[PDB]
Structure formats: C-alpha cells, structure tokens
Swiss-Prot record, chain A:
This is Epidermal growth factor receptor. Changing R5A: Abolishes phosphorylation. ATP binds at L18, G19, S20, G21, A22, F23, G24, T25, V26, K45, M90, Q91, D155. There is a cross-link at K16, K37, K54, K57, K167, K229, K260, K270 (Glycyl lysine isopeptide (Lys-Gly) (interchain with G-Cter in ubiquitin)). Changing E9G: Found in a lung cancer sample; constitutively activated kinase with higher levels of basal autophosphorylation; more sensitive to gefitinib than wild-type. The gene is EGFR. The modification Phosphotyrosine is found at Y169, Y298. The modification Phosphoserine is found at S291, S295. Changing L138V: Found in a lung cancer sample; more sensitive to gefitinib than wild-type. Changing E9A: Found in a lung cancer sample; more sensitive to gefitinib than wild-type. Changing L161Q: Found in a lung cancer sample; constitutively activated kinase with higher levels of basal autophosphorylation; more sensitive to gefitinib than wild-type. The chain holds residues 701 to 1014 of 1210 of the full protein. The lineage of its organism: Eukaryota, Metazoa, Chordata, Craniata, Vertebrata.
Swiss-Prot record, chain B:
Binding of the ligand triggers homo- and/or heterodimerization of the receptor triggering its autophosphorylation. Heterodimer with ERBB2. Forms a complex with CCDC88A/GIV (via SH2-like regions) and GNAI3 which leads to enhanced EGFR signaling and triggering of cell migration; binding to CCDC88A requires autophosphorylation of the EGFR C-terminal region, and ligand stimulation is required for recruitment of GNAI3 to the complex. Interacts with ERRFI1; inhibits dimerization of the kinase domain and autophosphorylation. Part of a complex with ERBB2 and either PIK3C2A or PIK3C2B. Receptor tyrosine kinase binding ligands of the EGF family and activating several signaling cascades to convert extracellular cues into appropriate cellular responses. Known ligands include EGF, TGFA/TGF-alpha, AREG, epigen/EPGN, BTC/betacellulin, epiregulin/EREG and HBEGF/heparin-binding EGF. Ligand binding triggers receptor homo- and/or heterodimerization and autophosphorylation on key cytoplasmic residues. The phosphorylated receptor recruits adapter proteins like GRB2 which in turn activates complex downstream signaling cascades. Isoform 2 may act as an antagonist of EGF action. Changing L4A: Abolishes phosphorylation. Residues 12-268 form the Protein kinase domain. Changing L47F: Found in a lung cancer sample. The modification Phosphoserine is found at S280, S284. This is Epidermal growth factor receptor. It is linked to Lung cancer: A common malignancy affecting tissues of the lung. The most common form of lung cancer is non-small cell lung cancer (NSCLC) that can be divided into 3 major histologic subtypes: squamous cell carcinoma, adenocarcinoma, and large cell lung cancer. NSCLC is often diagnosed at an advanced stage and has a poor prognosis. It is found in: Cell membrane; Endoplasmic reticulum membrane; Golgi apparatus membrane; Nucleus membrane. Changing I6A: Abolishes phosphorylation. The active site is at D137. The chain holds residues 701 to 1014 of 1210 of the full protein.
Amino acid sequence: QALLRILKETEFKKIKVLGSGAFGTVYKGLWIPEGEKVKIPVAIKELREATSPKANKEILDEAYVMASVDNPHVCRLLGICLTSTVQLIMQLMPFGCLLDYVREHKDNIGSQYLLNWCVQIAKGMNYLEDRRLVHRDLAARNVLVKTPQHVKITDFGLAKLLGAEEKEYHAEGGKVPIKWMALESILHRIYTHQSDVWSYGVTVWELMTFGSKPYDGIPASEISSILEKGERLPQPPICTIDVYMIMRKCWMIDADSRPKFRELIIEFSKMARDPQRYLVIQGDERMHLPSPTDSNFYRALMDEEDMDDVVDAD
Amino acid sequence: QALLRILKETEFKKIKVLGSGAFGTVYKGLWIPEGEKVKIPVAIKELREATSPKANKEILDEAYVMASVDNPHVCRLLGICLTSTVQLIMQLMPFGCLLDYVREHKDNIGSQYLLNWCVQIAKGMNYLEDRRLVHRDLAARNVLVKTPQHVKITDFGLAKLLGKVPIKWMALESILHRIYTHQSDVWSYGVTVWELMTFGSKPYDGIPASEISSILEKGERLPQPPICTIDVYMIMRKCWMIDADSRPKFRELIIEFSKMARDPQRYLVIQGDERMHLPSPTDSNFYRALMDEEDMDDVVDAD
Ligand SMILES: *CCC(=O)Nc1ccc(OC)c(Nc2cc(-c3[nH]c(CCCO)nc3-c3ccc(F)cc3)ccn2)c1
Ligand SMILES: *CCC(=O)Nc1ccc(OC)c(Nc2cc(-c3[nH]c(CCCO)nc3-c3ccc(F)cc3)ccn2)c1
Ligand SMILES: [Cl-]
Ligand SMILES: [Cl-]
C-alpha cells in the first residue's frame, strides 16, 4: 500500500508547536529527503497513547485507511513514524483551522464564504460516508483552511484509533467532545454517519456564530439531560429560519430523521446561489468571493489540487 | 488576462537572496495576503535597470504572455510588481535550479533521472513551440527543480524583454545574425543536455566566447560525455548542425529520450547506477501530495 510513507526519526524534525487537542500535539515540522539539501514544511501530530495496548500492525492498518482518502475536502494522511510515540505527518495548512479562522476574521466573513464552507464540509463528510467511515469528532477545530476558499476535514478515525477512557465522558472539559455528540453517542457509545450529521450541525452552528462555544457554561455532565428535555443550541443572529431549521433537524433524537450529508450538500448549495436571502450580514456586499485573478494566483501558489468550483451567487 | 496578478509593494517582502543571472537578482520572498495572517513563500526576480528601458504597456503585454503558459514543464509567471523597478513573482522551487542540482548530486544521479529530465525539458520546449514562443536562453540554469522527478523551464521571453549574452549556448545563426527561432532553441537544448550528461560542466571550457563562432564554423563541437553512448551523443550533434532545419524537432526529442528512458542503463553508462533508481510509488505519492499536486504526465520508467 504505497499511499502511506513510513518515516524514520532521522528524516524529519519537529520545530514550532502549533497547538494541542484531544488526540495529541500538532507541530510545524521539516521533512528532509534523504540525500537532499532541502527542508520541506510539514504538519506533525504526535499522538497520545491509545487507551488499549493494540499492536503496531493494527495502528498501521488504521493509518493505511487514513492514507487512502481521496477527496478535495478531506485531508489525506501522508506519513507515519512508529517509534516510542506515534507521529502522523501531512501537508501543512498555513491558514490554520476554521474555528480559529472565523474567530479571528469575525467582522470580515460574508455569507458566501460561510455557505460554501458548509457545502465543502458536507461534501467531505459525504465522501467519508461513501467510504463507510465514521469521523466521530467532526467540529470546526477539525476543519482546516487550505485557502479561505478551500477547507478540508481532518482527524477522522482518530477517536476510534485512540479511544477514550470512560471517566472522560463524565468529566469537565475533558477529551470527549460531549457538546458536539449526538445523544445516542453520549448515552450508549453509538457512532454512525447519522451521529456525524449531528456533529455537522454543531459545526455549522460554530461557523454561523463565528466560533462561539456550544452550550457554554452548561456542565458536560448535564448535556444529555438538557437534550432529552428538548433544549438545543440557539438560533445565531445571522441565520434565517431556513438555515436554523437545518441545524435543528441535525439534532433530532431519531437518528434516521436527521438529514443525509448528500441532502445537506444540495440544500447548502442552493442557499449559496442566493446567499443574502439565507444569511443576514451587514456590509455583506463587499465580502465577495475572490476575483478570478486572485483565485488563479491563490491556486497556482498554494493549492494546485483539483477541486469543485465554489458556488457563487446568481 | 486574469492569469497575471498585479501586486502592491506592501503585500510581499524579499527575505533571502537565492541567486543572480544576466537579467536580475532572484529572491526568496513572502507574499502577505491583505487581511490575512499568513506568509506564503514565493520567488521574486527583480529585473536590473535596462539601458534602453521599455514602455510600461510593452512590459505588461509580455508579462501577460509569460502568465499564459499552462504546461507541467514550463514555469508560469504568476504576478508582477511595476514600480521604479520590474519585479516578477512565481512559485518557489525549493530544490533550486537543475544546473546546481546536478553539480551537487554529481556522484549520485542515475541514468533514469538524467533521461527523464531530457524528456521533460523537451516537453516544455515543445509546448512553447506550440505557442509560437521562442525561449532564446535555454540552459540548465533556466531549468528549475520542483521535485527531483519534476523539472520546469523558466525565464522564457526574458531575453527579448530586456534586450550577458550566452554565446556558448546559442546557435551559430544567432551568434552571426541574431536570428532566434525554435530551431535555435533546439541548439540550446543540445547544450543543455550536454550540461546534464557532464553533471554541470562548463561548455567550451578555456575557449573565450569571442572564438565560439569561429570554432563552430570549423566543425568543432562539444565532446562526447563520458557516460553517454553514441545514441545520446548523436542526438546532441544533430542539435548543433549548421542547417537549422536539419536539427531535430522537440516533438522528436520527446520520443527518442522517452524511448531511451525505458532502458536507461543501455544508453547511459554510469558508475554505481545499480543504486539510484527513481522513487518508489510510495515516495512519489508522498512527494506529490506534499509539494507537487499539479497535473503531470508520469515519469518514463524502465520496463
Ligand atoms: C485550531 C486547530 C489548528 O489546527 N490550528 C492551526 C494553527 C496554525 C497552523 O499552521 C500555521 C495549522 N496548520 C495545520 C494543522 C493540522 C491539524 N490540526 C489539528 C487539530 C488541533 C486542535 O483541534 N490536527 C491536525 C493534524 C496534524 C498532522 C496530522 F498528521 C493529522 C492531523 C494539520 C495540517 N496543517 C493549524
Ligand atoms: C541555478 C540558479 C538558481 O536559480 N538556483 C536556486 C537556488 C535556491 C532556490 O530556492 C531555495 C531556487 N528556487 C527558485 C528559482 C527561480 C529562478 N531562477 C532563475 C535563474 C537564476 C540563474 O539563471 N530565475 C528565477 C525566477 C524567479 C521569479 C520569476 F518571476 C521568474 C524567474 C524561480 C522559482 N524558484 C533556485
Ligand atoms: Cl487533536
Ligand atoms: Cl536572471
């Protein structure tokens, strides 16, 4: 399986730490091809230890699946280093993750960017469902910005790889994303494509609120209770009722009543052709998608892979 | 049209000098998109102050042409900054130019890399000929290494834009009459191949440029490289025929070097060649996904 490069400790080095999450620590790194004089920037995540003593062969098998994804909106695992720690290597995304991007660019994001991001996340998740892969940790922090016009899903399958100890599902601010999880996942560890759809709804809510924390101030131990009582995330100020109803449909108790990712692609694509009808943002008229000139420059410089055209307004 | 972005001085910064040529100084630069927090590496060439400056409308017209090339083996001009100086911006090639690459790798380059580089250069030049574009300064220094498996021609059209003269790469008719054609580009292709097969030797070492037209008229040519079978050397000699129309075509050079690339050790005799193969599919997939995602024809591999 030539899609996963087995790297030795000697051919790459971790430099600047970029962040930390439930799954490990992310570094900006340099790959030094053997026999060459160049240093190639990469992203390295040094994983925390799985909650099970699984063979390196099982770790490699699951890494091969992560290296097999071929879709413009899913990040492909490129390499792995199995020494004392498991280190994953992929292409460096210099714009960061979408959660931090929307927080940092709050007052300058228009409806066309927001709706296209929802389309692209749904396209990537639809591909994962087609591959019979459940993400288990879809969130705005796990959507990466290759360019502001091109986002890609990362960290799929890591939850099942590393697992989580049972106490973390009852702790505060722990490793378990309780506030993104479907009720059936909280209560019974049930993870399906339809529970991914629930997390997609929370992810869209993150984007439409420009990075607000869902259920902020509500203890994680009481999330399952308030969900059972019918409480849900509030309507973001910029969202029309059409957009808010889609999010609410993603959080229905009956998993089979939730939308499908293929349906979400179509609906958000429709709204992207009339963006100001579905999101109300002030000064939206000067927050257009890039001109063809800037798009050509963007692509040739740092994003040469094939991708569907962004959905523009009619 | 929309293929050439006009940049402001404030949105990019030169950080490192990478090299210099007859036309100007090359910098590693950082592009800083307005409103963003990222710094994107780019290559910047600041052109030197010409003695017969061109009009700004003329400069932009040629920059649009340079920005219109769409081929995996020709570098596309991406941006320009037109102030007191002309600055050209394109994607940064971190492996450098092919001339310095083959010199630094003098002792580890295998026959399969050398022959494929000849294939790829011929593919890029054939595209330029398809576009009715004459390069005028093809040389190993003007071939850039995006990956060791993927080289691209740069600096086409700069010679005409700026009106220092690479006599030892030029066809005789270009030396005598300043005639530049696709067939004179073929002559420079022959010298470029000689550079690669000698691992970056200087052509006509010890002969002053003022004497080159004289020795060419006497029938003297660059010698057979030690690693080249006569099959490869005969192609080079055909590129240096006095009659431009008897020289090979770039389309023909693609086919011949591709043919040799399928049995590389038959056509280049290199010491230790039984070690330096092309990357495995694993290593090639890793290279492309990391830094070379553009569409390209696959390498010609030995069968
Ligand atoms: C908000 C989370 C984040 O990743 N921020 C961020 C700041 C600066 C960056 O470069 C200047 C990047 N680039 C990047 C990140 C990742 C990545 N992000 C995560 C989530 C962390 C917390 O949610 N995980 C990864 C990752 C890294 C390496 C792998 F092999 C697999 C997954 C990937 C690529 N580029 C991001
Ligand atoms: C052989 C000369 C050379 O360019 N060496 C080299 C050393 C280090 C590098 O990056 C670490 C690069 N990258 C690169 C170079 C160029 C480029 N090279 C030339 C010719 C120099 C002598 O002929 N001209 C350019 C150039 C730059 C910007 C433009 F708009 C047009 C042409 C381009 C991209 N990356 C090279
Ligand atoms: Cl993480
Ligand atoms: Cl130059």
